[PDB]
Amino acid sequence: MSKVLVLKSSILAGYSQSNQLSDYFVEQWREKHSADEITVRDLAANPIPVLDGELVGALRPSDAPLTTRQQEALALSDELIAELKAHDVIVIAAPMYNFNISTQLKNYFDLVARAGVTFRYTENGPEGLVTGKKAIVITSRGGIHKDGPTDLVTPYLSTFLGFIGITDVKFVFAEGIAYGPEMAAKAQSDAKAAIDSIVAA
Numbered sequence: 712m713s714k715v716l717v718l719k720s721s722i723l724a725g726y727s728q729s730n731q732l733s734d735y736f737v738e739q740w741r742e743k744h745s746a747d748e749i750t751v752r753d754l755a756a757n758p759i760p761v762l763d764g765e766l767v768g769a770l771r772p773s774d775a776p777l778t779t780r781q782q783e784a785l786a787l788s789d790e791l792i793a794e795l796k797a798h799d800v801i802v803i804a805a806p807m808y809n810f811n812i813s814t815q816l817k818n819y820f821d822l823v824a825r826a827g828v829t830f831r832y833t834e835n836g837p838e839g840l841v842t843g844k845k846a847i848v849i850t851s852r853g854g855i856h857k858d859g860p861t862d863l864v865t866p867y868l869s870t871f872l873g874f875i876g877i878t879d880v881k882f883v884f885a886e887g888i889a890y891g892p893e894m895a896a897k898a899q900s901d902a903k904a905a906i907d908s909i910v911a912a
């Protein structure tokens with residue numbers, strides 16, 4: 712029995728291509744794996760704060776008193792990390808905005824990456840502590856970037872996720888959305904088929 716976490720990060724709400732595919736993933740997983748628990752967190756509808764010079768100190772082990780704002784960010788970081796570690800299958804919807812991930816997803820990563828909690832340093836290098844996960848990235852783009860030099864999102868996601876221990880990552884692409892409704896529909900169909908194959912594994 713698995714627990715599935717779905718992280719939505721688009722700023723386009725119900726018009727989001729990656730959210731539509733995330734919803735399809737959930738629908739198909741419920742159908743094929745009816746006993747599994749599914750948790751969805753919308754990082755745009757419930758925003759994570761920007762990591763600034765005040766919040767960064769909240770995420771360090773210290774005996775120093777924290778500000779109210781720091782205490783709340785620490786509580787949120789702990790909540791996010793507990794949630795991430797409590798689920799088995801992690802689905803990350805990651806649209807490409809100005810050649811980067813969305814800030815909504817980035818703020819989540821910046822509260823989740825914490826030394827001694829989601830990674831630690833050993834005598835022979837970094838070690839990720841978020842273990843036993845299988846990750847699916849659903850990444851939507853207006854243009855066509857896959858396997859080219861302008862896709863920095865894919866290797867960045869592999870790098871960041873691997874650093875915290877999530878090395879088993881399958882990518883689902885929905886590209887060419889900006890070329891119009893016909894190409895957006897083909898991207899949806901192609902990504903749905905990649906999802907079907909993952910759900911059928």
Ligand SMILES: Cc1cc2nc3c(=O)[nH]c(=O)nc-3n(C[C@H](O)[C@H](O)[C@H](O)COP(=O)(O)O)c2cc1C
Binds near residue numbers: 810852889
């Ligand atoms: C603010 C913004 C920036 C974008 N930057 C890029 C980009 O750098 N490259 C690209 O191919 N598409 C870009 N797009 C198009 C989105 O990648 C495309 O609309 C995709 O469907 C977004 O996924 P979503 O619908 O789930 O938000 C951008 C869209 C927005 C709104």
